[PDB]
Structure formats: C-alpha cells, structure tokens
C-alpha cells in the first residue's frame, strides 16, 4: 500500500529527526564528567537475615514504607508478610491462583495486591475488621498475565500486563480509569515516580516508555537495549531511571536529556538482569542476575563495586528499604535474604 | 520493656500458628503433581481435558494431579513459560494429522525444540501426546496428501524394528506414525543428557487411558529423579 508505505516513510523521517536532536544534545558523556569523582571503593555487603517458609520459587517482594515489613509472593500460592527485624511471619495469605508473578504492598500498609497468570489483581486488606485476611477486591480487566502492580495510594493501583498494556484502577469500583497503550511486547515491570505523577514501564520490545498518570498519553520512549527489558526503577531524584534487560546490560536513561546516559556491562556477564534498584542516594545500582548473583554498580562510573553471592538459584526480585538501610533479594530457591 | 515483651510473645505465637498451618500446606503441596497442558487449540487438547488459566484436578490411584492449561494469554510464550520450570511434567499435545493444513506439525516441532533447549525448562520432562491418530490413519490411507511434500525425509525413512503396531493397522500408517514420533525423538535426544526426558505416546483425543499414561509417565519421572539423587542412574 502506498498510504502504508508513505506513513512508514514519515515515521522513519520522524525517528531520524529525533535521533539527530538527541545527538545534538549529546555534548559530552557522563563517563568523562565523573572522572575526577573518587571511586566508591569496595562494597562488602553481608547476609543479615534469611527468611524461610516459602515452598516454591519467589517471583516478587515489596518492602513496606516503614522499612520493616515486607511481603513476598511464591508460586506455591502464598503471600507471606514478614517482620524482617525478627524474621517472624505476620501473615500467610493463601492465594486463589497458585501462579502469582507480582506483589505490591500499599504505602499506607493496609493492603497488599498480587496477580499472575489468572489475569487478576487481587486486593487484600491487612487491617482486618474481624481478624482474618480476606479478598477485598478483584480487578479483572486485563487479557494478559499481570507482571507488576504498584499502589498509587489506597483506592488506586497501576498494573502492567502481558497484553502489552498498563492500566490504572479504581479499587472501590473495580474499574479501569485509564489504559496506557503503545508497547508492542509484554510489559514486564513498571516503576512509579516519587511524586506519583509519572511512571516508566519496560516491555519485551527492548523499549521503555514514560507515562503521564493523569493523562493516559505517552510522553517519551527510550531505546538502546537490545533484548527484553525485565526490570525498571527510577533514580531517587526522579529525573532518570535504570533498566535491566536480557542483553546482560543495565542502562541509565535521563528524562530531560531524553537518551541513554551510560551502560553497566562486563565481559564476564552473559546472563540477563531480572531486577534493578537504586540505593537511597542513587550512587549504587543493584541488579539481580540469572547467574544467581547480584552485582553492585557504581552509578556515576561504570565500575562494578561489589557482589551479593548468597543465593542458590535465580535471583528473581530485589528491593531497597525506603530509609536505605537494607536490601532484600528474593530467589527461585524459595529464600529471601537481607543484606547490609 | 514489658509491652515490648508482650508484643514479642504475641508475634511469636502468631508465627508459630502460621508455621503450623504451613506444615500441612507443605504436606498437601508435596503430595500433588503439577502438570502443564500445553498445545495448540486445534490439537484436541480441549477434548482431552474433558480467565488466563484453567485448573482441573483428577486423582489416579489415590495420587493427586493438578493440570493447568493456558487460557487468555498472548501467543508470545517466552516470558510466562518460565513459571512452569518446577512442574512434574509438561504435557505436549500435537495434531499428528495436521502435517499439511500451514505446516502445523512443523510449528509444533519448533515449539517443542524451543521448549527442550530453554535454560529454565532443562530439568522438566515432557509427556508427548501425538494426538489424532484416527485422523492421521485416514489421511495416510487416502493418499491425497503426501508427508514427503512437507518432510522430504519421509522418502528414505524405514519403519523402526521396535515398532509395535496395533492389530489391523496398515504398514503405511505405522510408518507415518513412527516418522512423526521420531522427529520429536530426534529433537529430544540431541540435548537430553539425562537431566530431563520425553515420553512419546500415540494418542486419540477420546482415549480413556490418557490419565493412566500420564500417571505412569509421572511415576517414571519421579523414580528417575530419586535414582538420580542417589547417583544410581
């Protein structure tokens, strides 16, 4: 079709124009600006806790806002809320569907959400009126598996799905209020901005998109990764984010420069990244890997700072406490480890 | 710190109660075998059975089986297929008669190959159901369709000696069946290494012994794993 051909030609012209604009804005690289910065040295983190009790592999964990309670989701159909200080189990929620791939803890701490191959985000209220944790709401709009979910607050939650879309929900009515479309592959993860006005999402099209929560439109699209993006996380500042991909690299993208800042890669690393998270200051980038390890990266430089080498199977998830005290890693060996 | 001691005692009691529940949950989980029923929608998979995932529970010889088939999911499988790395077996259902109508059997062969060589599924055994034999029989007997059109290897292929054709079965039907089986077997034996195994079965969608075949294959898988742990195999 000539109309299709000319539309594709116009899209190619627009992509070229964007590329030259980004090149024009690239006066110098982040690597050659941070030369005079002193290196962070060697980061030697030790396993402080090991949470046991999950029968099968763990896909997701999420810290509470109090930096003490965390929820973990396991493929044996269990949600466990742990008291990381004392390793005690606070709750053990049996799941209707055993195939859970994500879990979110509400910032207020009154709710947890989980979802997976059932295409449903289930909301449980922890602050039980009677005493027992029950299903509060089931969100059943997605036509593909849920890969991530994050509470904006109570009564609002953003989910990413395998149907290549992200959605915004009203928990009271159980209805989608906004649908975010534009990804061509499965959306694997999403990260809320600190102000909760925007969120980035990484999909299986090797691209990341910046969305406006209020206005369902997509603001920016970031490319540079070669394979599926499994993990995404905002810089604590909010003007940048990091992505983990199957191409065995992590990359840092700047929102205002609208391009890649630098790549964290090593020759010895040939396995994909499953999870990424920044430290409290953003100077360190923590990435989980398929080779059972977590690598701590200097964010401003490209130097690998340290390694977390405790897990016996694939590292599926990791998260850093809000106060930056500790980092927790879930794994397919059914163990959560706390590191300091 | 009296209030601290009281709340710590309450937390310890709650943790003990949760672990007491988790013990019986573990007992239930270990006694159940989980199966991934994976195959094309035109392969007779639905008839074998009788939301993004459907569950059916059947008990064979007082042994619990939990079989999951794919529901509302996109055709891109490379991400959600990793959820089934620890299942007892993956039941693969293939339409044997669909060797001409799209090279459907070639697509099934490629899917099986990618399943076999995936790093996360390398320890998972596959129960293979070469379905629709009552259709492949009439397809071969009629002669209107040639397997050699889509698989040139069928010209030089000879029926294996270990073949055990059913009574009253045409030699051409048996040769076609065993050629289709040997394609999957050739894929399997390339990178087996003893870590996981394949159990081909000539199947019809209405066969009443399918649960028995699944039970026997799962029991063989469990026995092989246990013998591997003792380094006997």
């Amino acid at each position, epitope marked *: 079709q000539s109309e299709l051909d000319q539309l594709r030609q116009e899209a190619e012209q627009l992509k070229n124009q964007i590329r030259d604009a980004r090149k024009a804005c690239a006066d110098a690289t982040l690597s050659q600006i941070t030369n005079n910065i002193d290196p962070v040295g060697r980061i030697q983190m030790r396993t402080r806790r090991t949470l046991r009790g999950h029968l099968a592999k763990i896909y997701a964990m999420h810290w509470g806002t109090d930096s003490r309670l965390l929820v973990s989701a396991s493929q044996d159909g269990k949600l466990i809320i742990w008291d990381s200080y004392t390793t005690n189990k606070v709750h053990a929620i049996p799941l209707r569907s055993s195939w859970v791939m994500t879990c979110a803890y509400a910032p207020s701490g009154n709710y947890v959400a989980c979802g997976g191959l059932d295409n449903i985000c289930s909301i449980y209220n922890l602050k039980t009126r009677e005493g027992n944790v029950r299903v509060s709401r089931e969100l059943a709009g997605h036509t593909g598996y849920l890969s991530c979910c994050r509470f904006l607050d109570d009564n609002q939650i953003v989910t990413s799905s395998g149907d290549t879309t992200c959605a915004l929900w009203d928990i009271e009515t159980g209805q989608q209020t906004t649908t975010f479309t534009g990804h061509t592959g499965d959306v694997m993860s999403l990260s809320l901005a600190p102000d909760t006005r925007l969120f980035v999402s990484g999909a299986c099209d*090797a691209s990341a998109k910046l969305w406006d929560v209020r206005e369902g439109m997509c603001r920016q699209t970031f490319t540079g990764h070669e*394979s599926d993006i499994n993990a995404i996380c905002f810089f604590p500042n909010g003007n940048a984010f990091a992505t983990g991909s199957d191409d065995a690299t992590c990359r840092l993208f700047d929102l205002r420069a609208d391009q890649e800042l630098m790549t964290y890669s090593h020759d010895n690393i040939i396995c994909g990244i499953t999870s990424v998270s920044f430290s409290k200051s953003g100077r360190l980038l923590l990435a989980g890997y398929d080779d059972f390890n977590c690598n701590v990266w200097d964010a401003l430089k490209a130097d690998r700072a340290g390694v977390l080498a405790g897990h016996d199977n694939r590292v599926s998830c990791l998260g850093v406490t809000d106060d930056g005290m500790a980092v927790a890693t879930g794994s397919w060996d059914s163990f959560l480890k706390i590191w300091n | 710190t009296e209030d601290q001691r009281n709340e710590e005692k309450a937390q310890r009691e709650a943790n003990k109660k949760i672990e007491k529940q988790l013990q019986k949950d573990k007992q239930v989980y270990r006694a159940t075998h989980r199966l991934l029923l994976l195959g094309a929608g035109e392969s007779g998979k639905n008839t074998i059975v009788k939301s993004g995932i459907f569950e059916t529970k059947f008990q064979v010889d007082k042994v619990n089986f939990h079989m999951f088939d794919v529901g509302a999911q996109r055709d891109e*499988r490379r991400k959600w297929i990793q959820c089934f790395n620890d299942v007892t077996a993956i039941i693969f259902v293939v339409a044997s008669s669909s060797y001409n109508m799209t*090279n459907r059997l*070639q697509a099934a062969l490629k899917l099986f190959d990618s399943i*076999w060589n995936n790093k996360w599924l390398r320890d998972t055994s596959v129960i293979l159901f070469l379905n629709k034999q009552d259709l492949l029989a009439e397809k071969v007997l009629a002669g209107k369709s040639k397997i050699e*059109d889509y698989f040139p290897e069928f010209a030089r292929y000879t029926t294996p000696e270990d073949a055990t054709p059913e009574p009253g079965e045409d030699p051409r039907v048996t040769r076609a069946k065993y050629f289709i089986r040997d394609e999957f077997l050739r894929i399997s034996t390339a990178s087996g290494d003893g870590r996981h195994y394949c159990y081909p079965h000539f199947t019809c969608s209405v066969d009443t012994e399918n649960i028995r075949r699944v039970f026997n294959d799962c029991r063989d898988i469990i026995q092989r794993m246990h013998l591997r742990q003792y380094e006997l195999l």
Partner: nanobody
Amino acid sequence: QVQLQESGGGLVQPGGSLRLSCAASGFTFSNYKMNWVRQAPGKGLEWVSDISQSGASISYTGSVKGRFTISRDNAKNTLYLQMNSLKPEDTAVYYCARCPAPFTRDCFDVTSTTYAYRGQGTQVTVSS
C-alpha cells in the same frame, strides 16, 4: 534501536532465483541466532530457516530444503536468503526475524503475529 531492513524481494518467474538481504543495526549481530519467516497471502506465519550465531548450525523447513540457502556475515551485520527454484506457493511476505535473547539455543516467538525484533518484510511474488 533494534532495526531490520529486508531487500531483494520482487517479481520472479517460476523456477527462477532471487536473493533476500537483511541489514541489521542496533544490536551485536554475532551474538544472536537469525531466522527467516514468511506470511502467505491470507494465512498465518511460518518459519523457514535459521542460522546459529557462528553460522555453523543451519536448519530449513521441509518445503524449501535443497532450494534455499541461508547465510550470515557477522562483519557486515547482514543476513542472506539465496533462493534457487521458486514456486507459486512461495509467494509470501518474507520477514527477517531475530531470536529474542543472545547466547541462547532456544528461540520461542519468532513466528508470533506481533513480535518485535522482526523487520517490516519484503514481498516475493512468483507468477507468470
């Protein structure tokens, strides 16, 4: 970004020869396994051929075996499909597909209806 251009497709007589080229950019070519897929008019996608990372392991679909040869040049980041004996049943849009992950033997979704890392495709018409 991951971008793939196919070229060389066009009208050809039955029994003729044609060559398909695939220019790749935005990723390390030598670390990935390449594929060729086609979409017949009004029918689904079918896998044709693939070549390993080094160019050693090559497999074809049965219908084209002995007729099509696949070739890759890691230095030039180019994938080829030389055609020898075309048939009217070979009339299809031919896509240059790439396996989703590097250093992997498996290759899942190259024939999906919506699959990234696949080019726009070039039309091959065989008629008289």
